[PDB]
Design a protein around this ligand. Structure first.
Ligand SMILES: [Ca+2]
Ligand SMILES: [Ca+2]
Ligand SMILES: [Mg+2]
Ligand SMILES: [Mg+2]
Lengths: 188, 188
């Protein structure tokens, strides 16, 4: 019962209404991002206290990883040995999501590599796509674990799809918020 | 270098710290839910204005669905005919998420069924699991579209996994926020 002029006029009116819904969608997403930023700051003193407490627990992080259903699948026998030198893991999330997040792994002096810290960083590149970069591992002579599944440590050098990279997100979103559940094993 | 007593004491201290992170996680999730509730109220006048404008556009909703990559796969030839009688679609989201959401479909008098409105409701049941329920369709004699893929209209009676029910979530989260993109087809 509407004329074709009335219909086109309604279509334009709907488009204007959609632009207004778009605006609210964006404002909502913005408020939500700020909430996450507020609470990332509120949790940080607690993660820092937890890091000091984990320093009291020998082999905390390798125990956590060996008991994790996804991470354990990536660890070979010699990788597990090397991870006994892992003293500290830190996850840092940047406010600007183009800056992404970083995972740092702190290692005591060990026979495999010279680095005191190994890190993998996740960010958006100039075209808006997920990318990653890492510390170059300075393996010691005859102890390159990357030279039979592939070593865990090839993760540091794997960048051909950060859009994916499940392991980074597992550490950021699962293990980092609560590693204690995986460290602890029921007694009998 | 820590005693086993010091280690157990640290483990308990970590558990306490985790409870404190847990609390912040929950407060963050709560603030985020309230933001979504605020903006659901702010968008509602715009969805209501849009409903009045869509009333001016013949066969708006069937056109939207036939041009939707997932919904079109569910529509048979006779379903499409029946959906030309669909005048109005409404999505209602309740604040308490145990109450879930509802989708209402308004139909002009048609040869297939007597109902003026067909609805599917999604909620959590007492055990916390997704469930759904619907209007009983009062098909007219010899015109039961459920009596060769199955009719679209069997969706109203399909409840054996609301945990899934992709179609409900596609309507709520994709089509409902912006159906105009699917209604509109470029000219040449
Ligand atoms: Ca456990
Ligand atoms: Ca289109
Ligand atoms: Mg034990
Ligand atoms: Mg056109």
């Amino acid at each position: 019962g509407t004329s074709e002029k009335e219909q086109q006029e309604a279509i334009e009116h709907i488009d204007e209404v959609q632009n207004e819904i778009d605006r609210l969608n964006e404002q909502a997403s913005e408020e939500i991002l700020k909430v996450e930023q507020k609470y990332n700051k509120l949790r940080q003193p607690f993660f820092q206290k937890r890091s000091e407490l984990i320093a009291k627990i020998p082999n905390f992080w390798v125990t956590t990883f060996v008991n994790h259903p996804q991470v354990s699948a990536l660890l070979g026998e010699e990788d597990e040995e090397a991870l006994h030198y892992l003293t500290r893991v830190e996850v840092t999330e940047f406010e600007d999501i183009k800056s992404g997040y970083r995972i740092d792994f702190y290692f005591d002096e060990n026979p495999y590599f010279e680095n005191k810290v190994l890190s993998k960083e996740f960010h958006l590149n100039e075209s808006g796509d997920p990318s990653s970069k890492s510390t170059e591992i300075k393996w010691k002579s005859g102890k390159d674990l990357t030279k039979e599944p592939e070593s865990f440590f090839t993760w540091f050098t794997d960048h051909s799809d950060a859009g994916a990279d499940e392991l980074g997100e597992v550490i950021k979103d699962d293990i980092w918020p609560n590693p204690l559940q995986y460290y602890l094993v029921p007694d009998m």
